[PDB]
Design a protein around this nucleic acid. Structure first.
Lengths: 74, 53, 453, 198
RNA sequence: UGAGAAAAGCCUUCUCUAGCGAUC
């Protein structure tokens, strides 16, 4: 930078909110950073894009008895 | 919990089908709205047959 | 035998706009457990971007335009020629209020383009809907007024009086008199943080949280009198102009400026940045208009010498730049597709009754607001306003119930002051220095007589 | 022999626990035991996974829970270490992804099958020495039996709304769940989420 | 109690219920 001076001091208050550890199963911090980039709210995505992003993993009917698996539905 | 209910009225007999319901907590302050509110009641109950007199 | 078998394609440029991954990174991964997560992340990103590409057809409006014929220059085209050639709806938006008995006026548009508030030097304060010709309030504080700004919705407005800072309702009822902020010259509001920034004559920059009502920061610039101030909407940082020729970047967390950029050989008197946060426009006493690239380079992209001095600068949502020199305003236009505005030749010109004291573009309309000694004028600027607005963020045609639902959502979503940095995505990157501190703790737990000498 | 359990999948199999700190697998059709594995301490109760035929969880007295694959019984799949007293009873959800354990200390915990730490813990002054816990059949409630002559009912999720929901309520609930797992590694999120008063 | 007290006409901000909407 020809005439620009950049403050090299770190913002400690902002650094408190950042993630300290590198989560499993990630070896490099570049790998973990990629997953968090995509936003998920309905403000930034269409309604059908929002629905596929918020798909629940387990769906249960409220009143039906759940039986164990039986030979791939026999 | 899918089952059929037979309701007898002065006008005739009605057969209805129940899709789903929270059975254990039904007699509780929050879940009771499921049957009280007409819109929520239509969600879980349908009229499959009606035979008037 | 189907001539075109494949599904409908989507434009690559449009998809690239709805993209937030860094493909340039060449990280190596040799583990399948790492690989499965990465491919899903790309799969999630690609499908969301495709859906937004199809939604481009849902957009219904088109930006305005103005091009001459038979070699005529658009600079010499006057406002009267435009008004007769445009529909009756837009023609009603051009008007010239004449209030010379009071001093020169400073004007501010609300974030929604429906409402306008202005303040006079002699102390005339009025707020009005400007689309319809109705007056919300019109009061005369006995003390002098230097600046006027809106606070989030149109309900609250802040005036920078001679002694202290005052807060008023949209109907003219005085609410707060803030004595900490004294001799304030300039006011400007950060919308998504609910912070109001004040520049004072004594040289102090103060941040006030309007949501809670407490002062979060008070910083001493140590640069003398402060009179030139602006914010970057993308960056949320505050720009300060000084007589040295340097512009300082400020955040509420730090007690020292983020960066200093030398831009002029003399004192700087104006600064403005675009909505995207890419380009920076400054003017100075050396009669030079400069455009800087804020995306890591900080070099002057364009330079032009001016006969008079550009007191004020502003940027629209489509990238048009207007400079106010004395009693004459000049607008420079460029294609704007990944390019700065072209300073080769201006787009439109207009002469005011008096010297210019304030400029701002209406958010979602093709009009320009000018405040001067004679009064307030509204120009017609075809192609300056962004056509398609979002109904859930800033709806001009919103009811009272819609407005109050939005305000709670914004209050639930307020950003803390300390998160402001030069990078709005700084929260995403892993704290590298905190990594190695953790790794250190992890490691911790895991010839014959020469012998007689 | 303390307990015996039939396997809900391939229903001819059996599991057993005895007083020599061993677990014995039987076979009803061929009328012979299959294999024996000895641990450090006695296992109080055994429970079969209702969605995985070859997986079972043993409640052991060394403050721990052991998840086993019966084909490869040399080493346990996972170890659960959040209890501080002898574990008495366990039971699986029919979804097969979680189980609830009773212990000698006056608390009950819920563990994910793939995690080694408990998701939540329930406690009360009036409840002492939980003897038995059974997970209800619709994956929504917890019932526990204690020695103070009372049986208590608990909720599977402490913040779910049981009644019929509208479209906006369901959309909001799904958005909240995806938000929590997206930002699960941030320190402030971890600080609030993992705090259980004891 | 002490922007005294009392009465009329206009805007601003907001509170309660009651139907109605969730059945594809």
């Amino acid at each position: 930078l020809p005439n620009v001076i950049i403050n090299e001091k770190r913002n400690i208050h902002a650094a408190a909110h950042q993630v300290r550890v590198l989560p499993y199963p990630f070896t490099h911090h570049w790998q973990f950073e990629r997953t968090i980039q995509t936003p998920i709210g309905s403000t930034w995505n269409t309604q059908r894009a929002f629905q596929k992003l918020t798909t629940p993993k387990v769906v249960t009917k409220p009143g039906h008895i759940i039986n164990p698996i039986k030979a791939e539905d026999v | 919990v899918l089952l059929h209910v037979l309701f007898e009225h002065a006008v005739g007999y009605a057969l209805l089908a129940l899709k789903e319901v929270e059975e254990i907590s039904l007699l509780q302050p929050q879940v009771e709205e499921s049957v009280l509110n007409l819109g929520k009641f239509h969600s879980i109950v349908r009229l499959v047959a009606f035979c008037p007199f | 035998q189907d001539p075109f078998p494949g599904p409908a394609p989507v434009p690559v440029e449009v998809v690239q706009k709805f993209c937030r991954i860094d493909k340039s990174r060449k990280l190596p991964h040799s583990k399948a457990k790492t690989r499965s997560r990465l491919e899903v992340a790309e799969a999630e990103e690609e499908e969301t971007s495709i859906k937004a590409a199809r939604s481009e057809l849902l957009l219904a409006e088109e930006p305005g335009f103005l091009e001459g014929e038979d070699g005529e220059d658009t600079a010499k085209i006057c406002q009267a020629d435009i008004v007769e050639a445009v529909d009756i709806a837009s023609a009603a938006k051009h008007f010239d209020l004449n209030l010379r008995q009071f001093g020169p006026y400073r004007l501010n548009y609300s974030r929604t383009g429906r409402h306008l508030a202005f303040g006079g030097r002699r102390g005339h304060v009025a707020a009005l809907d400007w689309v319809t010709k109705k007056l919300m309030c019109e009061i005369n504080v006995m003390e002098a007024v230097r600046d006027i700004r809106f606070l989030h919705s149109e309900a609250l407005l802040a005036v920078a009086q001679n002694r202290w800072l005052h807060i008023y309702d949209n109907q003219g009822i005085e609410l707060h008199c803030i004595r900490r902020c004294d001799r304030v010259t300039r006011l400007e509001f950060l919308p998504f943080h609910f912070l109001l920034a004040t520049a004072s004559e004594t040289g102090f920059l103060t941040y006030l949280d309007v949501s809670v009502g407490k002062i979060v920061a008070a910083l001493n610039a140590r640069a003398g009198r402060l009179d030139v101030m602006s914010q970057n909407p993308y960056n949320a940082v505050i720009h300060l102009g000084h007589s040295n020729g340097t512009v300082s970047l400020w955040s509420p967390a730090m007690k020292e400026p983020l960066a200093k950029i030398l831009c002029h050989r003399g004192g700087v008197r104006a600064v403005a940045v675009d909505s995207t946060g890419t380009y920076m426009a400054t003017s100075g006493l050396d009669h030079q208009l400069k455009i800087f690239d804020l995306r890591g380079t900080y070099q002057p992209l364009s330079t032009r010498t001016l006969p008079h001095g550009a007191g004020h600068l502003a940027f629209s949502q489509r990238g048009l730049l207007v400079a106010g020199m004395g009693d004459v305003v000049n607008i420079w236009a460029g294609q704007g597709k990944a390019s700065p505005p072209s300073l080769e030749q201006p787009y439109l010109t207009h002469r005011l009754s008096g010297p210019v004291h304030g400029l701002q573009f209406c958010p979602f309309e093709d009009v320009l607001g000018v405040g001067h000694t004679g009064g307030i004028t509204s120009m017609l600027v075809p192609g300056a306003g962004e056509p398609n607005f979002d109904g859930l963020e800033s709806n001009p045609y919103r009811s009272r119930k819609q407005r109050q639902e939005w305000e709670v959502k914004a209050l639930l979503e307020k950003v803390p002051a300390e998160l402001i940095c030069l990078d709005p995505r700084a929260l995403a990157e892993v704290d590298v220095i905190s990594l190695e501190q953790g790794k250190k703790e992890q490691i911790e737990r895991l010839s014959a007589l020469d012998r007689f000498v | 022999i303390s307990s015996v359990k039939f396997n809900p999948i391939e229903t001819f199999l059996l599991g057993s626990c005895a007083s020599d700190r061993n677990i014995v697998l039987y076979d009803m059709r061929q009328a012979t035991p299959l294999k024996k594995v000895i641990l450090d301490m006695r296992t109080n109760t055994i429970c079969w996974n209702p969605m995985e035929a070859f997986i079972f969880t043993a409640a052991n007295e060394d403050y721990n829970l052991y998840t086993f694959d019966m084909r490869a019984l040399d080493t346990p799949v996972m170890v659960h270490m959040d209890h501080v007293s002898a574990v008495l009873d366990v039971d699986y959800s029919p979804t097969g992804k979680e189980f609830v354990s009773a212990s000698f200390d006056k608390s009950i915990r819920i563990f994910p099958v793939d995690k080694s730490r408990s998701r939540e813990v329930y406690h009360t002054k009036r409840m002492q020495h939980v003897i038995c816990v059974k997970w209800t059949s619709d994956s929504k409630y917890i019932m526990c039996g204690s020695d103070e002559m009372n049986i208590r009912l608990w909720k599977a999720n402490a913040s779910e709304k049981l009644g019929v929901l509208t479209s906006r309520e369901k959309a909001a609930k799904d958005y909240n769940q995806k938000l929590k797992e997206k930002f699960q590694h941030y320190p402030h999120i971890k600080r609030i989420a993992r705090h259980r008063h004891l």
